[PDB]
Design a protein around this ligand. Structure first.
Ligand SMILES: Nc1ncnc2c1ncn2[C@@H]1O[C@H](COP(=O)(O)OP(=O)(O)OP(=O)(O)O)[C@@H](O)[C@H]1O
Ligand SMILES: Nc1ncnc2c1ncn2[C@@H]1O[C@H](COP(=O)(O)OP(=O)(O)O)[C@@H](O)[C@H]1O
Ligand SMILES: [Mg+2]
Lengths: 51, 506, 469, 202, 119
C-alpha cells in the first residue's frame, strides 16, 4: 500500500506536468487563431463595402 | 470618379440660373432617403450635430456635413420622408432638458415625457455632447456608495465618482445588482441630508417595451421612483435615438452633481449602445474597423464615462456614479467591446452563469471582481471586518479542490474549509432585499471571528434572520451607534463579542 | 496669414480648402476660433487635390459650419519646452490644463521632427544607474533605450516611477516627463496630488518632472499626438542642456491603438487583428527619437500591456523589438515581504552582458540568477518532503537563497510613509560588492531577516548586530 | 549586412564592434531603420543584392545577411494596403511570396564560364512564439536550401546557440564542407537528435 | 498532349509544383478588375484549375500519367488552392508536417492518403 501510494504520487505529478505543456501549446494556437479570425472577418466586410 | 449632390435633377437647376432660392443655408431639399439616412441637399449654415426638421414632422441630426449634400440621421421612420421634401434647420445643437422637475417621470432620448403625467418643469437646457471634467476640478473618492449587498459592500466597494462596470453573460446578475443599489437609497433620500442622498438614473437602452414597463412598476411600489430618472430608449425606434441615449442621460444627471447633490447613472446596457453607433456610421458611407465598428469605437464609450466624476469642494462637492452593464457573449471578458469598457472604468463586477445555479445569489466572483478605489471610499465600521474576511476568502478559493476528500483533511485544512463555506453563504441575499451598513457589520463579524463555525452549513440561512431580529430588540444601542458614527471604538468591540456569544448557545 | 474655408466635417476628419500657392503641407497645425475654447487644433494629414487637404481635429468638432475660417499656423503642433513646463499639466497642443497661468517659455519646438542620424548616435551601449538593488544587478537599464514596465493593479507601478525619477535627479541630475497617453479621468487627478506630497512636483519650490495630460475622453487626434508632445519636451533637455531625461508613457498600448483609429477613419485599409497598415512606421518614428546623442540621452520607461494575454499580437511584438530592458512586476511577491515586487527571473534586459557591464558584474549577475532559479523550482519538493530531507549542498543553497531574495528589496525614499524605514539609495559599485560577499560564504552566519528592507553591504552588518543586542 | 527593420541605436552599436576586430574593412552595411518610409525598407533587400552580385560575376565570393526577413514583409504590406489591393492570409497581398523568392534566387553559385563566383544568402526569420507554419515562415523555407531553427527553450538554459538538431538541416551542406571535420564527426547529426528524445523521457 | 494523340504514347507529366499555377494568377487578378475571393484569391479558381487538369487525362488514343505535387499554404489543407485540386486526382499523397519531425522517411500520412484503386 505504501509503494502504490508513492507510485501514484509520481504518476499524478507527471500527469499535471504533461497537462501544463499541452495547455501552453494550445494557448499559442488559440492566440494565433483569434488574431486570424479577426483579420478574416474584417476583410469580408471591407471587400463588400468597396464594391 | 463620380460624386453625388448635383445629379440629373439637382444638376438641371444651376444652368438656367445661379440664384433661384435665396435660402440655401437654413433649409434644404431631400435628395435620397433610406435606412434612416436622409441626404439633404444644401443647408450651408447648419452646424455639426445640429437638430433638423422635415416637412412631415420627423426630426433629424445632421452629422455628415459634406460639400454638396448633408447626411442627416432621421429619428423616426423612413416612410414619412420622400425625394424632394423640405428639411428645415432648428439652429441649435442636440440638447435635452435637465433640472429637478424630471424626477418622477419617464423621459425619452430627446427629453419628451412618455409616462403621461403632463409637462416637465425643466430648469435648464444642456447639450448631449458635453466635455468631461478636468484633472484640477476632481477630488479623491471618499464617499461610500451603499449598494445593499453583503458581497459588494465588503469586497469591491464602489464610491461616489467612480465607474463600476457590470460585466456578465445572459441572465447571470447584470441588471439585478443595479436595481438593488438604487432601491437601497431609501434610508438617505427620505431624510433631510442632501449630501447623503443619491438620485438614480436608469437608462434603458436596447431593451424591449415590456422590459421597461416592468422595471418602472417595481420601483414605484417600494417608493423608489420619486427620485429616479428613467430614460426610455427601446430598440423599436431609430438608430440615432438609441445611440444618443447615453449622452442625453448623462447631461440630465450632471445637473445634480454641479449643484451640490449626488447622482448615479446606470447605462443598461453598454453592449446595446455600441451597436446603435455602428449602424448609423455604416449607412453614412464611412470606413469600418474591427468587429464591424467605426474608428471612434474606444472614444465613444470613454467620453461618456469620464464625465461621471467626483468634484472638489470649490466646484460644489457633488459626484456622479456610472454603472455600465457590459453584456458579454459566452463568458469571454477579453472581447472587442468588453475590453474597451473594462480598461476605461475603475473596476468591474464579473457575473458567471455557473455560480448562479449553485446557490450564490447573486453570482459575484471574488477572484475576478476588484475595485480601484479600495478601502478609501467605505465606512470605517465595515472596513474593520472586511480586512480579515478578504484574506480568508482568498485562501479558501485556492484550496477549494480538497473539499471532495474530507477524510484526508488536516487541522489547518479543516479550519479554512469550514470558515470559507460559512462566509460565502452568509453574503448570499435574496432579490429586492438590501441590507444597511449596521446589519452587515454584525453578520460579518460573527463569521470572521469564529462564532459561526459551530453552526451547520444548512442552518446558515436561518441564522441570518435570527441574529438580525434579536439584535434589534436586545442590543439596539450597538446597532444605532455603528450607523451614526460609522466606526468602532474599544467599547463597541467588547459589547459585540458578548452579545454574539450568548445567542450562539441556542 | 494663410486663411482657409471648411468644406467637410465628418466627425474628427475635417477638410479645409485653401488657395493657390498658400496650401499647407503635411503635419501642419491649423487654427480655428470657437466659442468657449481658445483654438481648435487640426493637424493636416494629406492633400486630396483641387486646392483641398484633409485634416484631423484634435478636439471636438461639434458646432462647426460649412464655411468657417481656418487659419494656418505655418508649422506643426508646437509645444512649450524648457524648465517652465516642470510642475505644470500640459496637453497635446502645448496648453496648460492645471489652471496655474500660462507657461512662460522662451521658445516653442514642434512635435513633428526627425530623429538622430547614424553618425550622431552612440557607438557603445551604456548602463543607466537607477539606484535599486534589483535593477542595477539583474535587468540593467540601457542609456537611451526603452524599458517595459509590466504589472497589475496594486503591485507597485506608481511607486516605482516616482522613486526612479527622484533618484536620477539627485545622482545624475536629470528631469522626467510623465506623458499619460490614453489614461483615465480619475487616474490623472490622483497622480498629480500624490506627487506633490512626496516632493516630486513643487508649486512653490522646484519641480523635477513634467506632466502631460492625455485622457481618452478626447478624439482620436489628441490621443495619437500625446506621445509626440511628451517626447518633444524631454528631448530638448538632452540636446540643449545635456541631461539623461526619462520619458514615461502610460500606457504603451494606448499609443498603438490611437494611431489605428485616425488611420481607419481617413480611408486606409486595416491590417492584421484590425490594426493599421503603417504599424512599423508609426511605432518606429517615436521610439527612434529617444536615443543617445553626443550631448545627452533619453531613456524610455513605458508600460507595455499585452492584448488578452498574448505576446504574439501586432501591438505586443512591434513594441518589444525596440525595448532594451524590461521591468516585470509579478503578483507573486508584494504581500510576501518584498518592497517592491520585482521579479529577479522574469525581468530581463539586453544590456546584461560581459561586454557592456564588465566581467565582474556579469559573474555576480549569473550567480544570483542561478541560485534564485534553483530555489523556485525546488519549492514543489520542499512542501512534500520537508526541509531536512536534502543533501549538504542543497541545504546550504536553500538558506542563502532566502536572504538573497530579501536583500534586493530596498526601501525607497517616497515609500517611507508605508513601511516606516528610511530610503536607501545603493549605487552600482555597492550593490555588486554586497552580492558577491554573500555568495562566497562571508555572510552565511547572519540571519534571514537582517537583509530585508536594507541596501548595501554596510546596512546588513549594522542591522544584524542590533537585532540581537 | 542588410539591417532592415532594426532600430537606430542597434545599427550604430553593431558597426562599432566589427571595426574593432578588423572586420569592417571588407563588409558592406545597408542601413535601413524603421523610422524611414515604407518604400526604403522594402527596397533594402533588392538594393543590397545588386551590390553583392558584382563580386560573384567577376570572380569572388559574397555573403549577404538579410536581417531580418520578417521586417521586410511588414514594410511591403504597408504600401500595398494603401493602394487599395486585395489582402490574403495574414493581411498580405498576392505577390508576397514572389517578393522573397525573386531576391533569394539570385544568390547562386556560377559556373566556370561565368567567373566562378558565388553569393551566399543568410535570411533571418522572426517567428512569433515558435510558429514555423505561418504565412511568412513557410514561404521562406520553401525557397531556401535549408534553415537554422533557433528554439527559445534551450536558449534560456545556457545552450548558446540553441540549434535544434532535429529541425535544422542543410541540403547542399554535405558536399560543401571540409573533409577533416566530416570524418571526425561520424554520425554526429543522427546521434544528437536521438539523445535529445531519450533524455526528455528519462 | 501531342505525343498521346498524334502519336499514341503513354506520356508522363511531372509538375513541380502544381500549386504555383493558382498562386501566380491571384497576384494579377486584382489589377484586371476582378474582385477578391476567399483568402484573397481570384474568383475563377475552379474554372481556371478545371480547364488545365481536364486536358491531362487518358483518352482513346493514348494515356497520360500525371504526377503533380501540391503545396499546402502554411500547413493548411482547407485552403482554396489545396481543397479545389483534390477533386481532379485519382490518387492523393498528403504529407503531414507532424510525422516528418519524428523520423518517418517520408511522412506518408495513412489516415489522409486515399485513392480510387484501393479495392
Ligand atoms: N440574486 C438573485 N436571486 C434570485 N434571483 C435572481 C437574482 N438575481 C437575478 N435573479 C433573477 O434573474 C432574472 C433576470 O434578472 P435581471 O433582470 O437582472 O437580468 P436580465 O436583464 O433578465 O438579463 P438579460 O438581459 O441577459 O436577459 C430575474 O427575473 C430574477 O428573478
Ligand atoms: N516600497 C514599498 N514598500 C511598501 N509598500 C509599497 C512600496 N511600493 C509600493 N507599495 C504599495 O503598493 C501600493 C500601490 O498602490 P497603487 O499605486 O494604487 O497601485 P499601482 O502601484 O498598481 O498603481 C501602495 O498602496 C503601496 O502601499
Ligand atoms: Mg438587464
Amino acid at each position: 500500500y505504501a509503494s502504490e501510494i508513492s507510485a501514484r504520487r509520481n504518476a499524478m505529478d507527471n500527469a499535471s506536468k504533461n497537462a501544463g505543456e499541452m495547455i501552453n501549446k494550445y494557448s499559442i494556437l488559440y492566440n494565433r487563431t483569434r488574431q486570424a479570425v479577426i483579420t478574416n472577418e474584417l476583410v469580408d466586410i471591407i471587400t463588400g463595402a468597396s464594391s | 470618379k463620380a460624386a453625388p449632390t448635383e445629379v440629373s435633377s439637382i444638376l438641371e437647376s444651376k444652368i438656367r440660373g445661379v440664384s433661384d432660392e435665396a435660402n440655401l443655408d437654413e433649409t434644404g431639399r431631400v435628395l435620397s432617403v433610406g435606412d434612416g439616412i436622409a441626404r439633404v441637399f444644401g443647408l450651408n449654415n447648419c452646424q455639426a450635430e445640429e437638430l433638423v426638421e422635415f416637412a412631415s414632422g420627423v426630426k433629424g441630426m445632421a452629422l455628415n456635413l459634406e460639400p454638396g449634400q448633408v447626411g442627416i440621421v432621421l429619428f423616426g421612420s423612413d416612410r414619412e420622408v420622400k425625394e424632394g421634401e423640405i428639411v428645415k434647420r432648428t439652429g441649435k445643437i442636440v440638447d435635452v432638458p435637465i433640472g429637478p422637475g424630471m424626477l418622477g417621470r419617464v423621459v425619452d432620448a430627446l427629453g419628451n415625457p412618455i409616462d403621461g403625467k403632463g409637462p416637465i418643469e425643466a430648469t435648464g437646457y444642456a447639450i448631449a455632447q458635453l466635455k468631461a471634467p478636468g484633472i484640477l476640478p476632481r477630488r479623491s473618492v471618499f464617499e461610500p456608495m451603499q449598494t445593499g449587498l453583503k458581497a459588494v459592500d465588503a469586497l469591491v466597494p464602489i464610491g461616489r465618482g467612480q465607474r463600476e462596470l457590470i460585466i456578465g453573460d445572459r441572465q447571470t446578475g447584470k441588471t439585478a445588482v443595479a436595481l438593488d443599489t438604487i432601491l437601497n437609497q431609501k434610508r438617505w433620500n427620505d431624510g433631510n441630508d442632501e449630501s447623503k442622498k443619491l438620485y438614480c438614473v436608469y437608462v434603458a437602452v436596447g431593451q424591449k417595451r415590456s422590459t421597461v414597463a416592468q422595471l418602472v412598476q417595481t420601483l414605484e411600489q417600494n417608493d423608489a421612483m420619486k427620485y429616479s430618472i428613467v430614460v426610455a430608449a427601446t430598440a423599436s425606434e431609430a438608430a440615432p435615438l438609441q445611440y444618443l441615449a447615453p449622452f442625453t442621460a448623462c447631461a440630465i444627471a450632471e445637473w445634480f452633481r454641479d449643484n451640490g447633490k449626488h447622482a448615479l447613472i446606470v447605462y443598461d446596457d453598454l453592449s446595446k449602445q455600441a451597436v446603435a453607433y455602428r449602424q448609423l456610421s455604416l449607412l453614412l458611407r464611412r470606413p469600418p474597423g474591427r468587429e464591424a465598428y467605426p474608428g471612434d469605437v474606444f472614444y465613444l464609450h470613454s467620453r461618456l464615462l469620464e464625465r461621471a466624476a467626483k468634484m472638489s469642494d470649490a466646484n460644489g462637492g457633488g459626484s456622479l456614479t456610472a454603472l455600465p452593464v457590459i453584456e458579454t457573449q459566452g463568458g469571454d471578458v477579453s472581447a472587442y467591446i468588453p475590453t474597451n469598457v473594462i480598461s476605461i472604468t475603475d473596476g468591474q463586477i464579473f457575473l458567471e452563469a455557473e455560480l448562479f445555479y449553485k446557490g450564490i445569489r447573486p453570482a459575484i466572483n471574488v477572484g475576478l471582481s476588484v475595485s480601484r478605489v479600495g478601502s478609501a471610499a467605505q465606512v470605517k465600521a465595515m472596513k474593520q471586518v472586511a480586512g480579515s474576511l478578504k484574506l480568508f476568502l482568498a485562501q479558501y478559493r485556492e484550496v477549494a479542490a480538497f473539499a471532495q476528500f474530507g477524510s484526508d483533511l488536516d487541522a489547518s485544512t479543516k479550519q479554512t474549509l469550514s470558515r470559507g463555506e460559512r462566509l460565502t453563504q452568509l453574503l448570499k441575499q435574496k432579490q429586492y432585499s438590501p441590507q444597511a451598513s449596521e446589519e452587515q457589520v454584525p453578520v460579518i463579524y460573527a463569521g470572521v471571528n469564529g462564532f459561526l463555525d459551530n453552526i451547520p452549513i444548512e442552518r446558515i440561512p436561518e441564522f441570518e434572520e435570527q441574529f438580525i431580529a434579536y439584535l434589534k430588540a436586545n442590543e439596539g444601542d450597538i446597532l444605532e451607534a455603528i450607523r451614526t458614527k460609522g466606526e468602532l471604538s474599544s467599547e463597541l468591540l467588547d459589547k459585540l463579542k458578548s452579545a454574539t456569544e450568548t445567542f450562539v448557545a441556542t | 496669414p494663410a486663411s482657409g474655408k471648411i468644406r467637410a466635417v465628418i466627425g474628427a476628419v475635417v477638410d479645409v480648402q485653401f488657395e493657390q500657392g498658400e496650401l499647407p503641407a503635411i503635419l501642419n497645425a491649423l487654427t480655428i476660433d470657437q466659442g468657449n475654447n481658445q483654438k481648435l487644433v487640426l493637424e493636416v494629414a494629406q492633400h486630396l487635390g483641387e486646392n483641398a487637404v484633409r485634416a484631423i481635429a484634435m478636439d471636438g468638432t461639434e458646432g462647426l459650419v460649412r464655411g468657417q475660417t481656418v487659419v494656418d499656423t505655418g508649422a506643426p503642433i508646437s509645444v512649450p519646452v524648457g524648465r517652465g513646463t516642470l510642475g505644470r499639466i500640459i496637453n497635446v497642443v502645448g496648453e496648460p490644463i492645471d489652471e496655474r497661468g500660462p507657461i512662460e517659455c522662451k521658445q516653442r519646438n514642434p512635435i513633428h521632427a526627425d530623429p538622430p542620424s547614424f553618425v550622431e548616435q552612440s557607438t557603445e551601449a551604456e548602463v543607466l544607474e537607477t539606484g535599486i538593488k534589483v535593477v542595477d544587478l539583474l535587468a540593467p537599464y540601457a542609456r537611451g533605450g526603452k524599458i517595459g514596465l509590466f504589472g497589475g493593479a496594486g503591485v507597485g507601478k506608481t511607486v516605482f516611477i516616482q522613486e526612479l525619477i527622484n533618484n536620477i535627479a539627485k545622482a545624475h541630475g536629470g528631469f522626467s516627463v510623465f506623458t499619460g497617453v490614453g489614461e483615465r479621468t480619475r487616474e490623472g487627478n490622483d497622480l498629480y496630488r500624490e506627487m506633490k506630497e512626496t516632493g516630486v512636483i513643487n508649486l512653490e519650490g522646484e519641480s523635477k518632472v513634467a506632466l502631460v495630460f492625455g485622457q481618452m475622453n478626447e478624439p482620436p487626434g489628441a490621443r495619437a499626438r500625446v506621445a509626440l508632445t511628451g517626447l518633444t519636451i524631454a528631448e530638448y533637455f538632452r540636446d540643449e542642456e545635456g541631461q539623461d531625461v526619462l520619458l514615461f508613457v502610460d500606457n504603451i498600448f494606448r499609443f498603438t491603438q490611437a494611431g489605428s483609429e485616425v488611420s481607419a477613419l481617413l480611408g486606409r485599409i486595416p491590417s492584421a487583428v484590425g490594426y493599421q497598415p503603417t504599424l512599423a512606421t508609426d511605432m518606429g518614428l517615436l521610439q527612434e527619437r529617444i536615443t543617445t546623442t553626443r550631448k545627452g540621452s533619453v531613456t524610455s520607461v513605458q508600460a507595455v500591456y499585452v492584448p488578452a494575454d498574448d505576446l504574439t499580437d501586432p501591438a505586443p511584438a512591434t513594441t518589444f523589438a525596440h525595448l532594451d530592458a524590461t521591468t516585470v512586476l509579478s503578483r507573486g511577491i508584494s504581500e510576501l515581504g518584498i518592497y517592491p515586487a520585482v521579479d529577479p527571473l522574469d525581468s530581463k534586459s539586453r544590456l546584461l552582458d560581459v561586454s557592456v557591464v564588465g566581467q565582474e558584474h556579469y559573474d555576480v549577475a549569473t550567480g544570483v540568477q542561478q541560485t534564485l532559479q534553483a530555489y523556485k523550482s525546488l519549492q514543489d519538493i520542499i512542501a512534500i518532503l520537508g526541509m531536512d530531507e536534502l543533501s549538504e549542498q542543497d541545504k546550504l543553497t536553500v538558506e542563502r537563497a532566502r536572504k538573497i531574495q530579501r536583500f534586493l528589496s530596498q526601501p525607497f525614499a517616497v515609500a517611507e510613509v508605508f513601511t516606516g524605514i528610511e530610503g536607501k539609495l545603493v549605487r552600482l559599485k555597492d550593490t555588486i560588492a554586497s552580492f558577491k560577499a554573500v555568495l562566497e560564504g562571508k555572510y552565511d552566519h547572519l540571519p534571514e531577516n537582517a537583509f530585508y528592507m536594507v541596501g548595501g553591504i554596510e546596512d546588513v552588518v549594522a542591522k544584524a548586530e542590533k537585532i540581537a543586542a
